[PDB]
Amino acid sequence: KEACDWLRATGFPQYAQLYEDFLFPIDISLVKREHDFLDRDAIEALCRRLNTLNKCAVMK
Fold first, then answer.
1. Residue 44 to residue 26: CA distance in whole angstroms
2. Membrane-spanning regions, if any?
3. Is 11 left (phi over 0), alpha (psi -120 to 50) or beta?
4. Which of 32, 41, 49, 60 has its CB surrounded by the most CB atoms within 10 Å?
Protein backbone atom coordinates (compact mmCIF):
# COMPACT_ATOMS: atom_id res chain seq x y z
CA LYS A 1 0.00 0.00 0.00
CA GLU A 2 2.67 2.66 0.95
CA ALA A 3 4.03 2.30 -2.64
CA CYS A 4 0.57 3.02 -4.24
CA ASP A 5 -0.12 5.88 -1.75
CA TRP A 6 3.29 7.58 -2.34
CA LEU A 7 2.88 6.96 -6.14
CA ARG A 8 -0.54 8.75 -5.88
CA ALA A 9 1.17 11.67 -4.03
CA THR A 10 4.01 12.18 -6.64
CA GLY A 11 1.26 12.00 -9.34
CA PHE A 12 1.88 8.46 -10.85
CA PRO A 13 -1.56 6.64 -10.65
CA GLN A 14 -0.25 4.56 -13.63
CA TYR A 15 2.41 2.97 -11.32
CA ALA A 16 -0.16 2.42 -8.52
CA GLN A 17 -2.36 0.59 -11.14
CA LEU A 18 0.83 -1.33 -12.23
CA TYR A 19 0.75 -3.12 -8.79
CA GLU A 20 -2.57 -4.79 -9.79
CA ASP A 21 -0.63 -6.23 -12.83
CA PHE A 22 1.46 -8.49 -10.42
CA LEU A 23 1.20 -11.27 -13.12
CA PHE A 24 4.74 -10.20 -14.26
CA PRO A 25 7.61 -7.96 -12.90
CA ILE A 26 8.62 -4.94 -15.09
CA ASP A 27 11.90 -3.64 -16.59
CA ILE A 28 12.86 -1.11 -13.83
CA SER A 29 15.83 -0.22 -16.14
CA LEU A 30 13.38 0.75 -18.98
CA VAL A 31 11.42 2.93 -16.46
CA LYS A 32 14.87 4.52 -15.59
CA ARG A 33 15.08 5.75 -19.26
CA GLU A 34 11.52 7.23 -19.21
CA HIS A 35 12.42 9.50 -16.21
CA ASP A 36 16.28 9.68 -16.53
CA PHE A 37 15.94 13.49 -15.94
CA LEU A 38 15.94 13.04 -12.08
CA ASP A 39 18.75 12.04 -9.65
CA ARG A 40 19.48 8.48 -8.34
CA ASP A 41 18.05 9.63 -4.94
CA ALA A 42 14.51 9.60 -6.46
CA ILE A 43 15.48 6.51 -8.54
CA GLU A 44 16.24 4.73 -5.18
CA ALA A 45 12.77 5.61 -3.80
CA LEU A 46 10.94 4.75 -7.10
CA CYS A 47 12.97 1.51 -7.51
CA ARG A 48 12.21 0.55 -3.83
CA ARG A 49 8.42 1.03 -4.42
CA LEU A 50 8.36 -0.62 -7.91
CA ASN A 51 10.61 -3.44 -6.53
CA THR A 52 7.94 -3.97 -3.75
CA LEU A 53 5.44 -4.47 -6.64
CA ASN A 54 7.88 -6.83 -8.47
CA LYS A 55 8.69 -8.62 -5.10
CA CYS A 56 4.94 -9.34 -4.70
CA ALA A 57 4.73 -10.51 -8.39
CA VAL A 58 7.70 -12.98 -7.94
CA MET A 59 7.73 -13.73 -4.15
CA LYS A 60 10.30 -16.64 -4.24
1. 16
2. none
3. left
4. 49
Question: Quick one: which of 3, 2, 7, 16 has its CA closest to 49?
Answer: 3
Architecture of domain 1-60: Orthogonal Bundle (1.10)
Alpha-carbon distance of 31 to 33, in angstroms, equals 5
Method: NMR
Domain residue ranges in the chain: 1-60
| DSSP code, position 24 | S
Of the candidates 59, 60, 57, the one whose C-alpha atom is nearest the C-alpha of residue 28 is 57
Q: Residue type for 37, please? A: F
